[PDB]
Structure 1
Amino acid sequence: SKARKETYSSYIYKVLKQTHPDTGISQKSMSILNSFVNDIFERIATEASKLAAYNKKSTISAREIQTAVRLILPGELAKHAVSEGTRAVTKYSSS
């Protein structure tokens, strides 16, 4: 048997449709970008909860994630990342 495997490939392809509607993706490229988000997710979350443990505070929260991303990303990308995280969570909380 073979269990259903987690993937973000549909979302990756959709955002590529938004960017370049005429462009497709190779299978190897799609596996590569599917691995991108999981690798980033891990190296953000571990650092964020380690920072939370340094705070000796129970909850991993938005401030912890913001700090973790701005720690680990190179600064030029970090500015964009924190701005987009903040505006996204604000748009959500405005619901």
Structure 2
Amino acid sequence: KETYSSYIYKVLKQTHPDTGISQKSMSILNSFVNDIFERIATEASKLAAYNKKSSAREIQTAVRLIL
């Protein structure tokens, strides 16, 4: 139903106008993008519970440490 594919091809048109890709790459995109989402959500969950300050800096720290 819902497809990120149209937005992905919009970004492609921002980069390359007339290039074609495969469906297996799309499925791997789905898997890896979603597991990145899960990991980034997991990393920045209880950081606000490390000290009594419970935002943007949580996910910023997540991307700072995973990368």
Structure 1: gaps spanning 5 or more residues: 73-95
Percent identical across equivalent pairs? 100
1:36 and 2:32 aligned: yes
- Kindly indicate whether structure 1 or structure 2 has the higher relative contact order, using CA contacts under 8 Å at least 6 residues apart: 2
Q: Distance in 1 between matches of 2:39 and 2:3?
A: 18
- Give the conservation status (yes or no) of the 8 Å contact 1:12–1:33: no
Q: Deviations over 1:52-92 (max 9, x none)?
A: 2223433xx001111111011xxxxxxxxxxxxxxxxxxxx
- Give the conservation status (yes or no) of the 8 Å contact 1:45–1:65: yes
Give the superposed CA RMSD: 1.8
SS for the counterpart of 2:45 is: helix
How far is the alpha carbon of 1:27 from its aligned partner?
A: 0.9
- Give the conservation status (yes or no) of the 8 Å contact 1:13–1:25: no
Q: Which one has a larger percent helix, Structure 1 or Structure 2?
A: 1
Q: Which one has a larger percent strand, Structure 1 or Structure 2?
A: 1
Q: How many equivalent residue pairs?
A: 66
How far is the alpha carbon of 1:6 from its aligned partner?
A: 4.6
Structure 2: gaps spanning 5 or more residues: none
